[PDB]
């Protein structure tokens, strides 16, 4: 069966036909007992001195609002994103997960990762199904219909698959699948976790969220650093808390 021919026939994307799309439970519980209280801070990140965010972070999730997320609807250009001083708040060993979209971000987002000093180790793909709606408006450069987004993973310093399959969100809904959070937390990369350009709807235990549209803030740098003072400085986030 040629699903590409089938999509040309019927408007059903090939990913519509992927099927199915342990001890993992215990690891999830250890993550959940390990998680810091959620913390969040409204900040216009264009105008915001990033260095106020301390301590340096083990994980950075970066979800800038690309103009392409608003097909039928302040956007950030890759120009703006590349100027963020991401390297000033990243720990010497740390990880970045950058949502790149499906256009020039696949290239420009790689330039950022190198500019901030990371090498890319994984290319995580959000494949969007259209089971509930067998039509697209193409970017002028596009050769094919774009049915996916890329979240690039980066490492600097010394269980899950690289696919997320969900149904295409409603027009003007820009949320990324919450599955990206499970993939991250399962890596057990440390507990200082920053989500840049989060929203009220993305706040989450174990995470600090900073964004222009947050309606409330609770961030205090000294309180936040208190969660990781000894004897907690190096926990993976997947181990039992120290008494």
């Amino acid at each position: 069966n040629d699903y590409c021919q089938h999509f040309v026939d019927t408007g059903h994307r090939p990913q519509n036909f992927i099927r199915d799309v342990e001890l993992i439970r215990l690891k999830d519980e250890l993550i959940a007992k390990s998680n810091t209280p959620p913390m969040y801070l409204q900040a216009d990140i264009e105008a915001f001195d990033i260095r106020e965010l301390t301590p340096k972070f083990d994980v950075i999730l970066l979800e800038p609002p690309l103009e392409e997320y608003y097909r039928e609807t302040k956007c950030w250009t890759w120009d703006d994103i590349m100027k963020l001083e991401i390297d000033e708040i990243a720990a010497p060993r740390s990880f970045i997960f950058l949502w790149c979209g499906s256009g020039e971000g696949l290239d420009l987002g790689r330039v950022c990762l190198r500019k901030w000093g990371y090498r890319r180790c994984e290319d995580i793909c959000w494949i969007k199904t259209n089971k509930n709606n067998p039509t697209k408006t193409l970017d002028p450069k596009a050769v094919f219909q774009r049915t996916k987004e890329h979240c690039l993973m980066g490492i600097k310093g010394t269980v899950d698959i690289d696919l997320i399959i969900t149904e295409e969100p409603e027009i003007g809904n820009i949320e990324k699948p919450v599955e990206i959070f499970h993939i991250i937390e399962h890596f057990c990369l440390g507990r200082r976790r920053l989500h840049l350009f989060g929203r009220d709807s993305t706040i989450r235990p174990g995470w600090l969220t900073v964004g222009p549209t947050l309606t409330n803030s609770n961030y205090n740098a000294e309180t936040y650093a208190s969660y990781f003072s000894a004897p907690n400085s190096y926990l993976t986030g997947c181990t039992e808390e120290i008494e």
Partner: protein, 196 residues
């Protein structure tokens, strides 16, 4: 000449100027991740093969970056990226951090191609794994719907890749099989004793 054609050779040393221009070029290189070093991939004479059209370039691991390098050095802008979701015969899905469910194929444009059927397919392939290192036949159907009847050239193909309207080059092909008269003409002129 519409039926399959091929040239067993070393793509490093073949004078590809004899082959003419192609609406589509596809390459599935053996990346140094019988491989080629990175300088041998940069120096491949891709730029002569096309004036206007598309390049399909499979990549993996660090050739994800390096293939973007060759792609740009060779004169292309990357305009799309196809991913193939690997399944079994029952449509379930099959890098030291995450398990890999896909292979990547960069899509690059050169010049100004006109009369192509952009938008017909979508950038995801779902299809069953065949041999090791064996790309899915669906890409040929997508490439034929995008640019029907035009000439296409595949670099680093194996015998199973030979397709109508395509000229396959690779060092595991059986001999030289050429039917287009101009290609036969330029091939005998440049290679009178049939040795490359």
């Amino acid at each position: 000449l519409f039926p399959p054609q091929w040239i067993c050779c070393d793509i490093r040393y073949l004078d590809v100027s004899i082959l003419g221009k192609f609406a589509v070029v596809m390459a599935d290189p053996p990346w140094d991740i019988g491989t080629l070093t990175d300088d041998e991939m940069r120096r491949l004479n891709i730029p002569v093969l096309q004036d206007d059209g598309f390049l399909f370039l499979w990549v993996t691991g660090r050739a994800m970056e390096l293939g973007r390098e060759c792609l740009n050095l060779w004169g292309y802008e990357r305009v799309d990226e196809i991913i193939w979701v690997k399944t079994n015969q029952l449509q379930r899905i099959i890098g030291h951090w995450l398990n890999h469910g896909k292979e990547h194929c960069l899509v690059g444009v050169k010049g100004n191609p006109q009369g192509f059927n952009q938008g017909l397919d979508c950038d995801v392939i779902v299809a069953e794994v065949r041999s090791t290192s064996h790309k899915p036949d669906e890409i040929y159907g997508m490439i034929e719907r995008l640019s029907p009847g035009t000439r296409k050239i595949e670099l680093f193909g194996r015998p199973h890749n030979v397709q109508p309207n395509w000229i396959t080059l690779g060092n595991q092909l059986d001999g030289i099989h050429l039917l287009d008269p101009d290609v036969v003409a330029r091939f005998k002129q440049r290679y009178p004793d049939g040795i490359i």
